[PDB]
Design a binder for this molecule. Structure first.
Ligand SMILES: Cc1cc(=O)[nH]c2cc(-c3ccccc3F)ccc12
Ligand SMILES: [Zn+2]
Length: 209
């Protein structure tokens, strides 16, 4: 059911999605251990993900969440990196994409910083890096991230010093780093249907000059 439409680098849509990738790269406390050392990406391809059944499943949950939240879906566009990207675009988010040992509980994690999502592309902690070179910092192998449509509803705000249930009366968690002033937020949902993987982004990290 999924088809992938290539966006043209000349399309303004390509350009804004790229802009969202590039502008939300930050430094990481791990010095680049998990995701590699870089300031920017070489974007190789951006594809629109089209699945009518996954879309309808998303919008159905959105309306529900909306209605429970004073007509406010609190829909964001957020990054998600994961070794399961190929499975997610075809069958959608589920409990097997949940982070059991996450700071904010057992659910699916999403990030405002593209470089936060890039840390998970090879697994928790960057796993053992790219399959070809075992390099968490590989500048050669093609990586992929999702830029997703996420329904937050009433988000429970959790400060951090940086599948479960949502907190009673809440539809998601906002994990908001309180120490690193430059680290953007992360969000957790507990239902696969609250996220839609709209864009599939293919890229390399770029070695700094
Ligand atoms: C925090 C986070 C951001 C993100 O873009 N992707 C993640 C994936 C996971 C994850 C969960 C289960 C299996 C593999 C993963 F990479 C955990 C946390 C994140
Ligand atoms: Zn590699």
């Amino acid at each position: 059911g999924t088809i992938l439409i290539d966006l043209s680098p000349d399309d303004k849509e390509f350009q804004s999605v790229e802009e969202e990738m590039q502008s939300t790269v930050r430094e990481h406390r791990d010095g680049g251990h998990a995701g590699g050392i870089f300031n920017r990406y070489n974007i190789l391809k951006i594809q629109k993900v089209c699945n009518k059944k996954l879309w309808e499943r998303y919008t159905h949950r959105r309306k529900e969440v909306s209605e429970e939240n004073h007509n406010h879906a609190n829909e964001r566009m957020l990054f998600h990196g994961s070794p399961f990207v190929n499975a997610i675009i075809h069958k959608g988010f589920d409990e097997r994409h949940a982070y059991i040992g996450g700071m904010f509980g057992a659910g699916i994690y999403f990030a405002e910083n593209s470089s936060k999502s890039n840390q998970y592309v090879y697994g928790i902690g960057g796993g053992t890096g790219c399959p070809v070179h075992k390099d968490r910092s590989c500048y050669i192998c093609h990586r992929q991230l999702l830029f997703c449509r996420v329904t937050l509803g009433k988000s429970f705000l959790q400060f951090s010093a940086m599948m479960a249930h949502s907190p009673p009366g809440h539809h998601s968690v906002t994990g908001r780093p309180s120490v690193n002033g430059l680290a953007l937020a992360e969000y957790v949902i507990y239902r696969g249907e609250q996220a839609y993987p709209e864009y599939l982004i293919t890229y390399q990290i770029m070695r700094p000059e």
